[PDB]
Design a protein around this ligand. Structure first.
Ligand SMILES: *[C@H]1O[C@H](CO)[C@@H](O[C@@H]2O[C@H](CO)[C@@H](O)[C@H](O)[C@H]2NC(C)=O)[C@H](O)[C@H]1NC(C)=O
Ligand SMILES: *[C@H]1O[C@H](CO)[C@@H](O[C@@H]2O[C@H](CO)[C@@H](O)[C@H](O)[C@H]2NC(C)=O)[C@H](O)[C@H]1NC(C)=O
Ligand SMILES: [Mg+2]
Ligand SMILES: [Mg+2]
Lengths: 481, 481
């Protein structure tokens, strides 16, 4: 009965990059066709616009500050990770008899002997990199075949990037141009095996596209009309087409729910090798709309009618929506998301009315930075980010320091999705929204306790993964292509 | 044999406003469905981003400086207008036996006894306003029924706005909320009458949406989810649906070519009551992409296959493309556009490789401001505009004075459609494009002679249209609702 679920999650992909979201030069045919036969969201969000906190909110349905996933992101030597008491979507579904698998980027911790890796958090199978593909030296890696080097060199002084098969190093570093093929092969096996055992599968595909540095296989190099950022987006798009064909071939089209979203806004610091937030303001690292609002598509033939919704939805609602769909019971913890099945099935409206946004570096004195309720969004604090540097808007830059706003900056997103015109710079409708927004912020700030910081547990270079354990000299000896 | 042609031309509508171009809250179902069954252009342009010069380029296929359509726009007391020796598309088709008609905004001149009005430039029928609907006092007009006044008051000290039937005042001022119905009725009659006489029709629908001040009939007031700008865009969209139904009802779907575009970018000076250029920079009044690049759709069942093109196209190419399609010979003058039928019919590529952009206020010493060839665009001079004021980008503002750039600012629009990263801030590909761009500008500037300025012929208040001729006191006595 339960449907097969495929969750595709891109990296550093903006609201404005898909062809079907208006980009003028992107090449995204498979995703455009998924949009045309399914539900496209205009108002779907993540609560925090950084890699780690966003992946944690997705898998647990819980605001990242509750389990210490702040500040910033995790690094290869981090001691901390997503606590093992947290229940993930993979576990909710595993206990209901799903065969669960994950391909790609984890970024939720490695820890002493890989205690925080995926196999310990409900995934039966796992093929991927445990953090971002730029958190290790890349001046000698090939990003585009036959021999175009990755640009800029990535993070120095670390072990090369490891490709893992569950808990074992399969390659270090992997060959970037062939990663996609590896991941499609893995996905195909997971599907077929689940079919054979008469059980539903759950595929978590956490792509490295479109994070820096850009790369692709040889079928896409110089073929998109948007340079390296495009080639890489085009490969991600072809991966979606490949998964849809594999779902075709096995006669599972009407029994599989396919969801596509992305973790956080574009890193405009990469300039034309980085994403695009379209009409929205600023990008990764900020609580402006270009940082937190992402593309989101839902496709399930004969169940989800083709259309466009403007209803409020969050990555936080994915656990409870998927549980409900699979007839799995919810964990016994406070959750911050809701079941969106009525909306998906067209029998009801989204139950979500409000959204809460935390910054990259949160603190308990300040609390939530921005809150949206209906079409209104208030900003109590504003701050630019180096990840959103280089565009013409000065509020996006790292030089825009942390600034308090009281009364808050107040925008009507139905008319000013670009956050250009502060309404408080009077009306009874506005005043009532203002008072609601202020009370929602004070209620959440008083009820939420911050879990102890995982990131502040520190770093220990002995925690880096090494293909040749015991090796010397570290870290350059750790390798095995 | 010749197909029936319907040309829909919007006013002050941005690249980012249609639902099918990515807007998150616009309501444009009929246009989205036309896009889904026809050709959508990502790179279609006008040469000058102001009302008058743009309408002149559209109807003649000639750069506006050749016949003196500069500087700025025409006003109700202007003595000048589009010269009668110019040949328009309506004339090209009339001489081939088309029954031609125009509904809406003209803005190409009135003159002594209406010598410059449409009936003198090849249109058989004409129902509309001879200039923009804000060039006359509007503090007492109703913009939205039952009694919501137009915001801000419009231009003062002038005659109220006249609605004309050929050369006669039908109302002054008209009732804004019922204008659409008038225009649809007129369009329906034109179609039917042409059918009855066994002849092809040419409908030129120059909408007032989405120019300030916004207005609509009662079916759309407060129904879009984007306020007044949305309500007005929603009515324009319903007008398109109505014309498509009328084409249905008469069995002419496969014999009619329908084209939709807009004259110039958004007036962001109206803030949330103005348009949106999406990812593009700046708006009306500038030579940045948000000023000159517009939405553009072509629909003709069983002739134009549904798709998306990135090929170069201009409003300048419409005359020669429509002539060719109707088997009508081209006027004997130098034209600046090309026939795009191969592209439309999918048997060839666009013949256009370059585009030339003039500012609102051009001069013969400076010449062309910006030139695009392939994916490269050079800016030799840059300037902001009060029509593009109020956004966060400072280059769009009226305080950004006229600035020369030598060497020019150079952008690769396939990767940086947002014009953020100057390539000259080295490569052999870049250097060759640079030299090409410089030579194209110098060739055009040396070959083009500016026609004598029509706008500089001055104003004469006796040229204002008056419903009660001889009247006193002018101009308030001129009226007849
Ligand atoms: C690591 O672990 C999983 C299982 O723990 C490995 O896979 C299994 O895959 C083969 C066929 O592909 C089956 O015969 C077994 O029954 C599978 N076990 C389960 C529980 O599914 C796999 O080699 C590794 N993960 C991957 C795909 O890298
Ligand atoms: C002004 O002029 C046109 C014609 O010059 C008027 O219309 C004609 O319309 C009626 C039916 O609608 C026909 O009987 C005539 O044959 C038409 N003439 C032509 C040349 O088409 C019309 O009333 C006015 N224009 C509009 C529609 O306002
Ligand atoms: Mg990310
Ligand atoms: Mg205009």
């Amino acid at each position: 009965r339960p449907p097969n679920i495929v969750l595709i999650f891109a990296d550093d992909l903006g609201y404005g990059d898909l062809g079907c979201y208006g980009h003028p030069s992107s090449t995204t045919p498979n995703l455009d066709q998924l949009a045309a036969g399914g539900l496209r969201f205009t108002d779907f969000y993540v609560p925090v616009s950084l890699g780690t906190p966003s992946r944690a909110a997705l898998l647990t349905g819980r605001l990242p500050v509750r389990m210490g996933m702040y500040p910033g992101v995790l690094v290869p030597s981090s001691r901390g990770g997503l606590p093992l008491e947290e229940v993930t979507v993979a576990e909710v579904l595993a206990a209901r008899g799903y065969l669960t698998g994950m391909a790609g980027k984890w970024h939720l911790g490695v820890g002493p002997e890989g205690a925080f890796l995926p196999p310990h958090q409900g995934f039966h199978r796992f093929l991927g990199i445990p953090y971002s593909h730029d958190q290790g030296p890349c001046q000698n890696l090939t990003c585009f075949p036959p021999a175009t080097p990755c640009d800029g060199g990535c993070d120095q002084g670390l072990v090369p990037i490891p490709l893992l098969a569950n808990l074992s190093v399969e390659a270090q570093p992997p060959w970037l141009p062939g990663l996609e093929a590896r991941y499609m092969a893995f996905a195909h096996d997971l599907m077929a095996d689940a079919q054979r055992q008469d059980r539903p599968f759950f595929l978590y595909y956490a792509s490295h596209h479109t994070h820096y540095p850009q790369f692709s296989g040889q079928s896409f190099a110089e073929r998109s009309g948007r340079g390296p950022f495009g080639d890489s987006l085009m490969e991600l798009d072809a991966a979606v087409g490949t998964l849809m064909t594999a779902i075709g071939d096995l006669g599972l089209l009407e029994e599989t729910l396919v969801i596509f979203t992305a973790d956080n806004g574009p890193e405009t610091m990469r300039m034309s090798r980085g994403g695009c937030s379209g009409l929205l303001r600023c990008g990764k690292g900020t609580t402006y709309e270009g940082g937190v609002r992402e593309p989101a598509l839902a496709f399930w033939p004969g169940h989800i009618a083709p259309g466009v919704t403007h209803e409020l939805a969050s990555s936080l609602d994915l656990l409870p929506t998927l549980a409900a769909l699979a007839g799995a019971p919810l964990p016994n913890v406070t959750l911050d998301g809701f079941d969106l099945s009525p909306l998906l099935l067209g029998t009801g409206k989204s139950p979500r009315q409000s959204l809460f946004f935390y910054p990259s570096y949160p603190d308990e004195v300040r609390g939530v930075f921005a809150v949206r309720t209906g079409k209104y969004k208030a900003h109590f604090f504003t701050q630019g980010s180096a990840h959103s540097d280089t565009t013409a808007d000065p509020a996006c830059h790292a030089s825009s320091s942390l600034t308090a706003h009281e009364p808050p900056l107040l925008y009507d997103l139905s008319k000013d999705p670009g956050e250009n015109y502060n309404l408080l710079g009077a009306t009874p409708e506005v005043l009532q929204a203002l008072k609601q927004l202020q009370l929602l912020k004070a209620q959440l700030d008083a009820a939420v306790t911050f879990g102890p910081s995982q990131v502040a547990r520190g770093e220990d270079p002995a925690l880096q993964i090494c293909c040749h354990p015991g090796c010397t000299p570290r870290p350059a000896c750790c390798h095995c292509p």
